[PDB]
Symmetry: D2
Subunit: 163 residues, 4 copies
């Protein structure tokens, strides 16, 4: 089935800028991974935001919900920061307009542009999850699927975990 990928920012997309003396959320790394993936099927990417997910407001989550509803596609990947991925995912789970879609959130604990990143694995795993899971909203990280309503980010473990 056609997959629509929305990019909202996060650590996955961070890149170094000399002006900042550090990282900024940069161009979406999922486009760099899919460029070499030799894809057979119909996939397209849309930018929604370039924010660290710590910076997301309730107005941002509402805007993300409406944007995902602008896609006719029933299989959606949203790349996002991990720090408020649960808050977005739980918000999207409450939108009756998205009930027929499979919506998977993912991202990376280490930027794709930094050595030793989880990003490319996570993108492959999450694209499969978006194609194969039944309608609902899910987090695909750490090589497994999480139910947002029963998940939290454990900042001491650096992992999502059950509540």
């Amino acid at each position: 089935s056609p997959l629509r990928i929305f990019t909202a920012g996060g650590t996955i997309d961070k890149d170094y800028r000399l002006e900042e003396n550090g990282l900024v959320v940069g161009d979406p790394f999922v486009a760099e991974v899919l460029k070499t993936a030799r894809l057979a099927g119909a996939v397209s990417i849309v930018a929604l935001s370039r924010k660290d997910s710590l910076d997301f407001t309730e107005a941002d989550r509402e805007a993300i919900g409406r944007a995902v509803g602008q896609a006719v596609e029933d299989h959606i990947l949203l790349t996002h920061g991990t720090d408020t991925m649960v808050e977005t995912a739980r918000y999207l789970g409450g939108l009756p307009e998205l009930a027929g879609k499979t919506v998977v959130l993912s991202g990376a604990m280490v930027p794709g542009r930094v050595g030793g990143s989880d990003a490319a694995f996570n993108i492959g795993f999450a694209c499969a999850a978006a194609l194969m899971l039944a309608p609902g909203v899910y987090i695909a990280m750490h090589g497994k699927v999480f139910d947002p309503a029963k998940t939290r980010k454990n900042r001491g473990l650096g992992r999502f975990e059950p509540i």
Copy 2:
């Protein structure tokens, strides 16, 4: 305290995915399993046992090699299996495994890479992530996971000139 389960086992048979440069050869050999390098930085919740079966270019596989892969997969207790392999005779191995009654309750996915993981611009890491998800989520059967898609081995062939798996119409 919650214990993270480990329901996937991976077997490695070689292929372009695992190729690495050797100075003594003036070229590539089939080297150490690249899937182990991808999983090292995947930040997995579980742990994945990785078992080496062979280190061959799949052009070099014989019927006896295919039979030996089938015996190893049938011995596994896990019902979710990823086999990394060369793409050139991946369909032959997948169709062979499909005919084995000892695999009937297992989800067995074959994958690899058209470009070595250790070469720049490789599909390998994406393919591993996709294929791990497919091994978890697909019903029992035998599948090829490549190009961000699932292929039925009976209805698929390798197009070597264009470096892709394609349907038989």
Copy 3:
């Protein structure tokens, strides 16, 4: 001739840490480059500091000067941040105890662990400079050799330039 490499930190050595939500100055990247360089000769690496060079004090520059004087070797590479590389280099140029040494400072505008970094090139170029230049103190960046006394960092160009 034997080369002694001192690592003082800088952007070259930055690496991502989940706890920080960003980069820290991490393990010296020159050790990662030399591990695959297939070296023939005698080279050794010593850690001096893990600081962003913005954070260096006059006490730090004095301590760097004494540390370089602890090396018997007459060919020295000091990896360092670019923001106060001129201040360190000018300070070391004034130390009569270092007059017989060839001391080359280098680093990278982009961290070695980030994609698209100048670091490995810069390390190769700077190791040659440390071996081949006459006694003195030099900055080796941008594929050329700078005299510290006649150089400044241009933060608008992202380059060292003559004064």
Copy 4:
């Protein structure tokens, strides 16, 4: 306003440094010059003109190939030259160039890589930086810059089994 000079010219002749995977070949070919990829992110003050002479494994070089490299280097106006090349017959090309009176005023450095730049764990970027410095800083003559050292071609041989240039005692 100050103008950054460009005193180095680079010539590319191929070698392991430039190898890249090709699916059609099921293996490596000598591809696009890797030195161009290193210089793209080097943040150079100048600009370096890069000129392709050949795309060969140096095992394949003939006397006529060596003569054609000499003519191209002698034509250059620059007196600082880096030639990227295969390591297997780098000494033969370097000793040949050494005997050419048209190069007597030039600093000519040959370099390459034991591992392709496009393979993980390559010496190539380091070697390019080192060799660019050597081409700038060394007196007129012909040199091999490898292993973080400068070699005199008349006193050097390639040890293929151990993947290194070494002195003749």
